[PDB]
Structure 1
Amino acid sequence: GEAPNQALLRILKETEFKKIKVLGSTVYKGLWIPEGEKVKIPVAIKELREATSPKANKEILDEAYVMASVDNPHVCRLLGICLTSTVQLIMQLMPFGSLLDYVREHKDNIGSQYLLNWCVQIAKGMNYLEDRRLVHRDLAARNVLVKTPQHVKITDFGRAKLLGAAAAEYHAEGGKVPIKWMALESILHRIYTHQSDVWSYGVTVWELMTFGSKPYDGIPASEISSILEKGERLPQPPICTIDVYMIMVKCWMIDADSRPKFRELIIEFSKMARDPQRYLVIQGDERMHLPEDMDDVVDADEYLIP
């Protein structure tokens, strides 16, 4: 046996929400007004392109299946879908964009407290995904979103695989892949587990401590297998103490069960977030600070449906 997934999929009318402007090329920034609820919820609307490509609709509703089946503060909520000519995913708007573009744009403004809180919240998000027997398979800084600089959510469940009642690792077959974030076992034999997610968590933390540097930048993805089998890893980022970087190294052990458990990463970064300056050394660290009637505006996170 396995647990029934009793998640609600909400179908929304096109009339319940107003497309304000474009965010990506087709993701819109908009507002959702639940019929006779007197609440305005900032939303990001993912609308299909051609939306006649059957295989593309499979993907998007598979994203929807996974996103509806998650309810955690460090993982982004699917608010519902609109079944129009072109399927629309309606999600909580994460106004400040991908954490990757965030650390790139604000490296001069990002203190140790924020980096180390980001490491914890992402690890809470991921440890929630392990609790729900779910393997992300595409965790990177690009796929973490910034509701505020104090609060990030894991995203892109387009590659997430909902493990079996005894499916030890998720077998897969071909496509475009995240080589430079991937556990060695995934590159070589397409093995993906909560542990191979932890590996990508390590590349995710590396990206954050380097303020968004490209992992193995200028190294073809063809060699990455041989480089990792040869024992090579990503280098210690400047701002990183041996401590922090040693947690990243542990995430990249070849023995999967020798890597840290997400619940462990929470504890370890939590400890370090209690004394951030002792664990991350950044020029001017203490100096650092970060941020049409909207009367009935309410964040997705304060909008609860039973």
Structure 2
Amino acid sequence: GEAPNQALLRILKETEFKKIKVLGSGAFGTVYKGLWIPEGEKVKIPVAIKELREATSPKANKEILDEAYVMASVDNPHVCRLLGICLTSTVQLITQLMPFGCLLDYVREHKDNIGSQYLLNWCVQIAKGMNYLEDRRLVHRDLAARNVLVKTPQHVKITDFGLAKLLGAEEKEYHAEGGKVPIKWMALESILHRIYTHQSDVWSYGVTVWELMTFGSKPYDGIPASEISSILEKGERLPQPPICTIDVYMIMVKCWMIDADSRPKFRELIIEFSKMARDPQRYLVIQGDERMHLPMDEEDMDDVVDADEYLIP
């Protein structure tokens, strides 16, 4: 069968954490910011510390440690990695501090200062992260703008491995059981049949790109989740965002095709968005795109792609 997972689960003493201040609480438990000073070494590492709503539940530590397992096994610049766990009564997961927060809130707060270059770069980076997960045979099952974090405005990473599952070594799908799920980011075949593939993640990527291009709009705003599968069966989809050229919207629509193998692959999404990122104003139309601030080969140029963006399976 599958190859041995030789990742290191690092256990971190509680005396190594300092300046602990709360970032947010409620639905996802409680998230703190802090500093991590490892024992012998003269370094201070900004970190975020996650932990469920106080509690001591045996059902809860099972899910937390499933997340830790996945998050400890990933090493990519566009995926968040687990630094370690701390073994308090409910288990604490420790990761890198992402000072700018989640990408959904970032695009909402900075609507009027986000240029086309940033939007298309984020799309590339998210596609790189997702392609990496695909190479590790992992199906995320919860890709959305709320689950992308911002290290800097130039550098985002995918997070939230709570729902992630391994698509088998010889197998090509996953069949799920009960729980709560985000209907509005899900492929049709996931809603009806609980089938989950790399290609169901591509659907979710489409919806994530739509959220970014609409500067944080709620998909299918007003429509209740029980209606969504009927809407999608009729052939309705999310509308073309104001800023989007047909080129960009056509990529989104391809992610929402009924036949899953007709959707783009993450590797192709990397290529397409990377091309668009070299001439951003040709693909997104944003008022005041020159005045945007945040903290002969010319015949060839159309289809030029750097080798770093041309990825082999």
Normalising by the residue count of structure 2, what TM-score does the alignment of the two structures yield? 0.92
Shift of 1:142: 0.3
Secondary structure at the counterpart of residue 225 of structure 2: coil
1:32/1:278 CA distance change after superposition, 3 Å: same
Residue 271 of structure 2 contacts residue 309 of structure 2 at CA under 8 Å; is this kept in 1? no
- Cα deviation per residue 1:70-109 (whole Å; 9 max; x = unaligned)? 0000000110001122311110011101100000000110
Secondary structure at the counterpart of residue 211 of structure 1: coil
1:298/1:146 CA distance change after superposition, 3 Å: farther
Distance 1:293 1:17 in 2: 53
Aligned residue number for residue 153 of structure 1: 157
Shift of 1:51: 3.8
- Cα deviation per residue 1:5-51 (whole Å; 9 max; x = unaligned)? 00000000001111431011111010001111111110000123334
Q: Which segment drifts farther, 246-255 or 77-86? A: 77-86
Distance 2:310 2:248 in 1: 36
Aligned residue number for residue 185 of structure 1: 189
Shift of 1:2: 1.0
Secondary structure at the counterpart of residue 7 of structure 1: coil
1:71/1:133 CA distance change after superposition, 3 Å: same
1:305/1:81 CA distance change after superposition, 3 Å: farther
Shift of 1:299: 27
**What is the aligned residue count?**
306
Distance 1:305 1:260 in 2: 15
Secondary structure at the counterpart of residue 60 of structure 2: helix
1:167/1:275 CA distance change after superposition, 3 Å: same
- Cα deviation per residue 1:96-130 (whole Å; 9 max; x = unaligned)? 01100000000110000000000000000000000
Question: Where does structure 2 lack aligned partners over 5 or more consecutive residues?
Answer: none
1:295/1:36 CA distance change after superposition, 3 Å: farther
Shift of 1:301: 19
1:299/1:19 CA distance change after superposition, 3 Å: farther
Distance 1:166 1:285 in 2: 48
How large is the Cα RMSD of the aligned pairs? 7.5
1:183/1:303 CA distance change after superposition, 3 Å: closer
Residue 40 of structure 1 contacts residue 296 of structure 1 at CA under 8 Å; is this kept in 2? no
Distance 2:56 2:134 in 1: 35
1:294/1:117 CA distance change after superposition, 3 Å: closer
Question: Where does structure 1 lack aligned partners over 5 or more consecutive residues?
Answer: none
1:172/1:36 CA distance change after superposition, 3 Å: same
Seq. identity, %: 98
1:302/1:181 CA distance change after superposition, 3 Å: closer
1:156/1:117 CA distance change after superposition, 3 Å: same
Q: Which segment drifts farther, 50-59 or 263-272? A: 50-59
Distance 1:223 1:163 in 2: 29
Shift of 1:167: 2.7
Shift of 1:168: 1.8
1:267/1:207 CA distance change after superposition, 3 Å: same
Shift of 1:230: 0.5
Residue 79 of structure 1 contacts residue 90 of structure 1 at CA under 8 Å; is this kept in 2? yes
1:222/1:294 CA distance change after superposition, 3 Å: closer
1:118/1:130 CA distance change after superposition, 3 Å: same
1:19/1:163 CA distance change after superposition, 3 Å: farther
- Cα deviation per residue 1:156-198 (whole Å; 9 max; x = unaligned)? 0000001211232111122211100000000000000000000
Distance 1:175 1:11 in 2: 30
1:230/1:219 CA distance change after superposition, 3 Å: same
Q: Which segment drifts farther, 164-173 or 236-245? A: 164-173
- Cα deviation per residue 1:238-257 (whole Å; 9 max; x = unaligned)? 00000000000000000000
Higher relative contact order, chain-length normalized (CA < 8 Å, sep 6+) = 1
1:297/1:152 CA distance change after superposition, 3 Å: farther
1:198/1:299 CA distance change after superposition, 3 Å: closer
Residue 82 of structure 1 contacts residue 88 of structure 1 at CA under 8 Å; is this kept in 2? yes
1:192/1:12 CA distance change after superposition, 3 Å: same
Residue 267 of structure 2 contacts residue 311 of structure 2 at CA under 8 Å; is this kept in 1? no
